[PDB]
Design a protein around this ligand. Structure first.
Ligand code: HEC
Ligand code: HEC
Ligand code: HEC
Ligand code: HEC
Ligand SMILES: [Ca+2]
Ligand SMILES: [Ca+2]
Lengths: 324, 324
């Protein structure tokens, strides 16, 4: 009431309807093409890794590993964040280095430790699969050559735009139903507010809104915060950016373990205590941390129900997989 | 007419309704659990490989690689055959070493170059995921401890039993519609019959019915037939079994390239010519091989439309992934 209203002041429920991307209108055809591409492992050089591998729609849009493993079984430096609701973040990646989903999508396609593919190889492959060119024409009509690395990224973005998780019990709560979360969950909300967590995890996505040092008050240590990953410093070369990362969206945080960009903290409860100490210079008690987790559990929304695409088959001209 | 009737004499259309497994009744709950397990990468030690990785429902129930790659990016000796209709084969694997789908399923789970998992680790993991035990109870009621390696295999088998591809244009043809395949496809059928191919690829599954040398008339060479893979000889130790493999089902063969147990022949047309020479001591002409491919294309059925499961999340007690 006091606390319901305070909450309504800082957060917003996820909308039912996908957001509108600029310079990228959705249409059943464009959305459908992006779904196909999201699950097509032929976007990787090896023909074995899809977006779904590291952002599994079945497992909260993530891979439940410390750090993602891709081409050659190589591990990356970072935990894979969820694609769910990612559309409502202000920029993409832990260091915000991509401005939106379309710019983001080009990254994993070319990264040597993810899909390890090159644009020319991907385009050659897509044009050699006879069912794809017609789908790119329905998706991108009035273009003489619709099969381009840019249109892949565009198709994927409007598909991701549909990957939202409305109707979490907390969104029902924000919409005026007090009974939608438990007493305990409400007390966890009150702790979350009073302790200062919403400074950095607020708005429609409970996070995703800005960049902050990981360690405002204490260094979280060389395991939780690998000294080599200076976050936004590698993007801007600005000293003030060292160890600065985007605050994540806490939506669906209960099912996207492990936690932090390093993926080294498996227990959400430990994540809560580390936030208290590292960001706010406090020791949150065990009881208190438990109440905040209970609150954080009500941020899990309805998971998208995604039909696995039936992908168009190779032709004989399809490029060969590349595994080395 | 002459040829439609000859065909009706040797082949049967895939039934609409999944077959009944013995000692394994289907039920919405058991089927549903097996679907979840099929797409759950936590059946592998690394938490990254599911059945769907190497038998992708989007790509004809296969992985479109020469030979499958699994744990540690290790390649196996064999091409991954389709799970689609596999239920109608007389035994499972290229060498028939598993008698049915339930016995088959235990193989990839433990194989070091596939999922590389052990039964005790898999069971511990499944029991530690709070949403799984209730699902095993709905699937296997009246069992004090339903979460067992055997029940995983059972659930998966009744799910695979639903993964059938009815209504291929050839099945419409066999059902009395002459117009259901093209003139050319009918001439390819007539070549397939006259040349002797149905000796080994007949019945409801166009194959899957028995064991034959790969090289009845000529050695196909050390690339198409790696000299180290003696097929059924490694299962029976019987000399007469050397280089004997099960005939595959040719259903959906146009979308499950590459071909043979070695996965070394990418073009179905080359596969046809190699069958002619290796199995029947003939040189099938280019024109003739083209007509047979056209026929083989009408063996592609309606692909299952499979919802990607929303999998139950880990708890904090869930075993850690193992990547090494
Ligand atoms: C196929 C083209 C895709 C798509 C559409 C996305 N991914 Fe990934 N992803 C991976 C890792 C480790 C990260 C974090 C990297 C970092 O911050 O430096 C990402 C990040 C993303 C995002 C950003 C989401 C956010 O909230 O910041 C998005 C939208 C995204 N991915 C979508 C790991 C991998 C892989 C592992 C090997 C693979 C494959 C992909 N991603 C592929 C794709
Ligand atoms: C108040 C006590 C809280 C609570 C309960 C949480 N936070 Fe934060 N948070 C911030 C940043 C930049 C990050 C990313 C840091 C990194 O990994 O490099 C986080 C991360 C989290 C998580 C993990 C979520 C995940 O997907 O991994 C959680 C559960 C979390 N936070 C909860 C930024 C800030 C702040 C800005 C200065 C403040 C204040 C807080 N967080 C406080 C809290
Ligand atoms: C997850 C538990 C599964 C399930 C249900 C199946 N698979 Fe595989 N599979 C792979 C390879 C290379 C083969 C051929 C191996 C050989 O013959 O020696 C298989 C075989 C099968 C079959 C047999 C089908 C037939 O017609 O003979 C079936 C039913 C089957 N699989 C189902 C490759 C892999 C993997 C690659 C790394 C993974 C993972 C799996 N399989 C996992 C599973
Ligand atoms: C008559 C000319 C044909 C045609 C068109 C095909 N076949 Fe056969 N076939 C047999 C066996 C044991 C195998 C497996 C061999 C191995 O890989 O070790 C095959 C394989 C095929 C394929 C490839 C299908 C695939 O999924 O990889 C194709 C397209 C094919 N055949 C077509 C057994 C026999 C026979 C038994 C002695 C005879 C006769 C034929 N095949 C003849 C033909
Ligand atoms: Ca995570
Ligand atoms: Ca094959």
């Amino acid at each position: 009431e006091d606390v319901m209203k305070r909450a309504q002041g800082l957060f917003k429920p996820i909308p039912a309807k996908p957001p509108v991307m600029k310079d990228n209108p959705a249409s059943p055809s464009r959305v459908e093409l992006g779904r196909m591409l999201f699950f097509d492992p032929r976007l990787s050089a090896s023909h074995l890794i899809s977006c779904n591998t590291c952002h599994n729609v079945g497992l909260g849009g993530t891979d439940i590993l410390e750090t993602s493993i891709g081409h050659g079984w190589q591990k990356g430096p970072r935990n894979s964040p969820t694609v769910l609701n990612a559309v409502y973040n202000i920029a993409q990646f832990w260091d915000g280095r991509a401005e939106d989903l379309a710019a983001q999508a080009k990254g994993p396609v070319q990264a040597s430790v993810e899909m390890n593919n090159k644009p020319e190889n991907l385009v050659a492959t897509l044009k050699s699969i006879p069912g794809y060119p017609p789908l790119f024409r329905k998706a991108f009509p009035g273009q003489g050559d619709p099969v381009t690395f840019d249109n892949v990224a565009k198709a994927i973005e409007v598909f991701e735009a549909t990957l939202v998780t409305p109707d979490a019990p907390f969104d029902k709560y924000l919409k005026g139903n007090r009974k939608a979360i438990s007493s305990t969950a409400e007390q966890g909300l009150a702790l979350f507010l009073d302790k200062g967590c919403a400074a950095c995890h607020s708005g429609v996505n409970m996070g995703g809104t800005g960049y902050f040092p990981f360690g405002v008050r204490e260094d979280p240590g060389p395991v939780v915060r690998p000294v080599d990953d200076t976050g936004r410093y590698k993007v801007t070369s600005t000293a003030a950016d060292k160890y600065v990362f985007r605050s994540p969206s806490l939506r669906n945080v209960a099912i996207t373990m492990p936690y932090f960009h390093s993926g080294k903290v498996w227990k959400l409860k430990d994540a809560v205590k580390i936030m208290g100490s590292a960001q706010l210079g406090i020791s949150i008690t065990d009881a208190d941390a438990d109440k905040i987790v209970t609150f954080l559990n009500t941020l899990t929304g309805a998971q998208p129900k995604v039909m696995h695409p039936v992908l168009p088959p190779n032709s004989d001209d399809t490029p060969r997989p590349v595994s080395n």
